[PDB]
Predict the 3D structure of the following.
Amino acid sequence: AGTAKGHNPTEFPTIYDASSAPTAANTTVGIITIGGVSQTLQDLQQFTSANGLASVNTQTIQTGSSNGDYSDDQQGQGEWDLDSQSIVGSAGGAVQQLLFYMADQSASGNTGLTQAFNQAVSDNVAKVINVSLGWCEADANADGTLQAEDRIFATAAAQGQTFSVSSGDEGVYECNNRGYPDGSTYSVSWPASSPNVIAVGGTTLYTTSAGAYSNETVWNEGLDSNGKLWATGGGYSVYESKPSWQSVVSGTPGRRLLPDISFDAAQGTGALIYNYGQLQQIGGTSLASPIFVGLWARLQSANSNSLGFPAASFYSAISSTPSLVHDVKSGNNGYGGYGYNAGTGWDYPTGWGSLDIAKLSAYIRSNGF
Ligand SMILES: [Ca+2]
Ligand SMILES: [Cl-]
């Protein structure tokens, strides 16, 4: 069954059958960040230069008050590094432009992040926007953040923009102090639980000795030394109603089910990322979402950026056309015998699984999306 190892981001096209697709050279991509990206831009230069790629056109955008705090968060740089290098690698080494929509760190509440989302939608220049972040949806709901941000994502979807959002790293235990085992008590992350975004969960990725895809299982690496679970977020929103396209998954509640799709997330099978100059092997659903973003941006470039928000089409296409995905069947996203189990077809840990990009491209050529 393949081998578990780290991977250069430039390998993700081979792994997910995207090498025959155009690059994302004709599609602009956004990344939501918390604070600045000055070190991240140096790490991105290290990435493209080491891989012999053309340099990436970047812009940074202060999305809130002009007097806000956009200084670099040092630990955050590794996350913006994961996002940006994984997007560019998955995109085949080229994007039209990479836009960093930086959230103010000195704003009240969650308003810095809300303003970053808002700016990406108002500007309506990026076709695909990565969000490798989140938190307990019940906490977001309790202070009004959920409602305010969902309005923004609704505008995005109506405008034809794709927000991609990591499902979470806490398995079913998102709301229990961010991942502490809690028995049968299951919860999900915001903004992944929005029906106006594509929620991306996580796999453990096995490759053959030649580097081809072998298999994927659920991402679940168990507990760390603090006792926190590291596993793919998945479940259903307690607040958001089920969008009609999800009705194809029978026997589920009348709620937004997540994730929609999944890609590599296990640290043990994760991406090799330049962070403050040093190569580190990094996972999370923060990896899986940028993989999706880069791959989806290729399909946008192949289709003149004319593909709208793709949730309905994913559910109709994949339910009727199982060859479009790698269906994850093994593993669970809890602990101690609790959590959801993968299975045939759509499941709570992984949604439909990972996309086979060339097969999806051929489907889109025939059928539209
Ligand atoms: Ca499955
Ligand atoms: Cl909807």
